Amino acid sequence: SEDVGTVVGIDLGTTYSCVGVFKNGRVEIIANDQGNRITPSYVAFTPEGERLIGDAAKNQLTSNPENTVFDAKRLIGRTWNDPSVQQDIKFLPFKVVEKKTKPYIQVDIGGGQTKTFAPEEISAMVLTKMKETAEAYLGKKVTHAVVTVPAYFNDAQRQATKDAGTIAGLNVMRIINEPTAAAIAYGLDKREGEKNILVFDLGGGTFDVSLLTIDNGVFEVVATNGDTHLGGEDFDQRVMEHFIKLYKKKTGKDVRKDNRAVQKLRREVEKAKRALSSQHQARIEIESFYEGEDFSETLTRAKFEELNMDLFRSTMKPVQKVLEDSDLKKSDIDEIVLVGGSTRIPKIQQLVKEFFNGKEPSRGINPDEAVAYGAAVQAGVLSGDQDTGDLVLLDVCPLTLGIETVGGVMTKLIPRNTVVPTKKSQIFSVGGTVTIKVYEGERPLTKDNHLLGTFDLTGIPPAPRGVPQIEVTFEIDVNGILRVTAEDKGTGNKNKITITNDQNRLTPEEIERMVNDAEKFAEEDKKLKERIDTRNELESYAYSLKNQIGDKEKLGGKLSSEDKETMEKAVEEKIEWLESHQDADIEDFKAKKKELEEIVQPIISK
Numbered sequence: 001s002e003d004v005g006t007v008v009g010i011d012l013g014t015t016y017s018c019v020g021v022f023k024n025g026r027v028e029i030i031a032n033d034q035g036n037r038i039t040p041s042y043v044a045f046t047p048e049g050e051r052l053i054g055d056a057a058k059n060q061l062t063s064n065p066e067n068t069v070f071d072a073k074r075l076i077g078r079t080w081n082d083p084s085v086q087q088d089i090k091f092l093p094f095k096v097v098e099k100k101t102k103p104y105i106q107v108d109i110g111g112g113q114t115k116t117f118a119p120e121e122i123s124a125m126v127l128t129k130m131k132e133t134a135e136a137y138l139g140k141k142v143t144h145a146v147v148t149v150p151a152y153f154n155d156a157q158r159q160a161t162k163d164a165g166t167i168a169g170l171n172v173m174r175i176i177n178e179p180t181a182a183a184i185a186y187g188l189d190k191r192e193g194e195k196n197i198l199v200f201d202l203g204g205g206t207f208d209v210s211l212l213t214i215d216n217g218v219f220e221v222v223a224t225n226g227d228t229h230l231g232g233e234d235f236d237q238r239v240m241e242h243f244i245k246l247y248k249k250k251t252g253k254d255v256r257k258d259n260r261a262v263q264k265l266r267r268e269v270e271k272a273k274r275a276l277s278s279q280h281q282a283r284i285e286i287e288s289f290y291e292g293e294d295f296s297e298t299l300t301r302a303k304f305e306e307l308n309m310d311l312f313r314s315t316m317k318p319v320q321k322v323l324e325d326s327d328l329k330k331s332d333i334d335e336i337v338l339v340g341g342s343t344r345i346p347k348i349q350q351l352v353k354e355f356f357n358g359k360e361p362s363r364g365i366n367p368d369e370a371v372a373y374g375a376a377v378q379a380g381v382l383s384g385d386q387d388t389g390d391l392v393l394l395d396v397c398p399l400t401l402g403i404e405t406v407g408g409v410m411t412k413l414i415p416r417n418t419v420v421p422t423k424k425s426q427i428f429s430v431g432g433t434v435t436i437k438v439y440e441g442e443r444p445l446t447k448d449n450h451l452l453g454t455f456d457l458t459g460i461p462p463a464p465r466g467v468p469q470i471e472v473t474f475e476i477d478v479n480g481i482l483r484v485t486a487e488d489k490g491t492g493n494k495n496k497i498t499i500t501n502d503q504n505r506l507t508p509e510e511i512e513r514m515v516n517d518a519e520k521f522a523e524e525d526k527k528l529k530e531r532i533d534t535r536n537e538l539e540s541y542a543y544s545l546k547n548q549i550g551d552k553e554k555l556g557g558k559l560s561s562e563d564k565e566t567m568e569k570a571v572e573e574k575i576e577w578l579e580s581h582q583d584a585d586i587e588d589f590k591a592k593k594k595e596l597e598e599i600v601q602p603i604i605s606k
């Protein structure tokens with residue numbers, strides 16, 4: 001069987017991502033190369049053509065706002081016409097253009113080249129960085145992963161996330177629903193009875209609520225509901241609009257035309273929002289904000305709440321849907337688990353606690369890391385070789401699937417909250433061509449819901465004496481993703497042909513070209529780490545030799561007047577050179593380490 005290596009759990013978030021591994025009976029949430037247990041979901045290309053991912057990308061946003069990409073999870077697996085896309089791209093500083101009926105990200109990548117990236121490619125870069133983070137920690141290559149998606153992600157969003165994994169060079173062994181991952185983190189340890197858990201997951205971009213039963217390592221989602229375009233970024237945009245209006249009224253200046261000013265505001269609005277979760281006012285200040293003038297304003301918690309009042313209130317509707325679909329009531333809920341960074345907001349915690357008549361949420365759950373933690377547990381389990389415990393997940397599809405057969409019945413096929421994997425088959429006795437449209441959602445007329453895809457059965461040969469009998473199977477797999485297959489039942493032959501979605505999913509050929517492009521940048525990442533790692537070595541040697549030559553008792557007291565002049569000099573000579581050659585290639589740094597060795601060694605061995 002396949003050696004899957006160390007399987008990592010990656011929470012791929014709208015604003016932050018987080019990677020974990022299960023080793024020696026516990027989860028390690030892995031710190032990145034800057035020491036942060038979460039990594040911004042940001043990519044950028046510097047004017048010189050270098051790809052930054054994570055903190056470095058976020059840190060240069062104000063200086064380079066058109067070639068910095070973030071919030072790709074709000075675009076991934078969506079079509080251009082999607083009204084959520086059309087709303088969102090108005091507030092994103094990078095260009096988004098239509099390609100293959102989809103929103104592509106267009107940025108300048110250096111060398112005078114403009115490149116268009118699929119959202120899957122941007123998310124792939126973020127997953128690469130998470131993978132790079134895990135590899136540095138484990139001191140070995142990572143080939144396999146569990147990656148998270150919102151419970152309410154549709155089929156295309158699900159598939160596009162898995163594709164992002166493939167592009168990043170990861171075999172995604174499992175797509176796991178964010179609230180299900182969170183439930184594992186709550187429930188793993190627990191030596192207790194059967195519990196009804198409500199997970200309320202409000203992140204940077206998406207909202208999910210899932211109701212689970214948990215009993216001795218058995219986790220079952222009874223019902224899920226959410227909103228894939230509601231999160232922290234939305235609250236910021238509400239505050240941004242307020243202050244753009246305030247500044248215009250106060251000064252006459254409409255700053256919307258100036259990306260740099262807008263991104264400086266957004267940066268400070270984000271910090272202020274966070275501050276308002278622990279204080280009742282926050283100051284927003286920007287030195288030379290616009291045309292040389294200072295921005296200085298205060299935001300109150302009351303005002304923050306008022307600006308977002310409808311959005312915060314709307315989070316209760318999913319809670320009510322899951323309770324109704326589960327056939328439970330409020331008092332049946334044993335624990336409330338808050339996850340996602342936005343659950344820090346006091347008004348959100350208050351709405352949830354009030355809804356549950358004063359009940360305290362479950363304590364000790366880090367809302368930014370719980371999802372990755374659970375993912376890492378499932379990944380530990382899929383590894384085989386871990387001290388995890390027994391873990392049995394039964395999750396559900398979020399959306400009712402229905403079909404529209406042209407010249408046939410329109411019909412509901414698989415209700416929302418059906419345990420996956422699941423399937424349903426339909427016989428078509430029409431012959432000729434059969435075109436089937438699949439829809440996702442809860443509106444009673446099937447075709448008023450979201451179009452998942454169009455599927456054509458093309459080749460039906462003649463059956464002299466028998467009936468045209470094509471059986472189409474609609475299967476939702478353990479990743480929550482639909483496969484449509486067709487088999488001829490009148491013949492005897494058992495040929496389960498996969499019917500391909502005409503709503504342009506990435507083909508294996510297209511995916512592989514994106515892989516090749518990603519691998520080119522990964523090569524550069526490899527060189528750079530290697531080059532910096534040696535420059536660091538040479539610089540560490542040198543500055544540590546400065547505190548040994550500067551050890552007048554030990555090594556210093558040994559050296560003569562002739563020796564230490566041909567030593568203190570060699571050290572300073574090297575530091576001097578280092579200070580003017582930070583950009584030098586991996587060759588040169590080896591040389592100068594060796595030059596500083598062949599001049600130090602003869603002396604130190606006397």
Ligand SMILES: Nc1ncnc2c1ncn2[C@@H]1O[C@H](COP(=O)(O)O)[C@@H](O)[C@H]1O
Nearest residue numbers: 013016204232274277340341342344368
């Ligand atoms: N203290 C806070 N108050 C309000 N929102 C926060 C806070 N900390 C993080 N967030 C939001 O949580 C989102 C990130 O969630 P996550 O990816 O789970 O860390 C972003 O929208 C953050 O602004």
Ligand SMILES: [Mg+2]
Nearest residue numbers: 013015016204
């Ligand atoms: Mg996030």
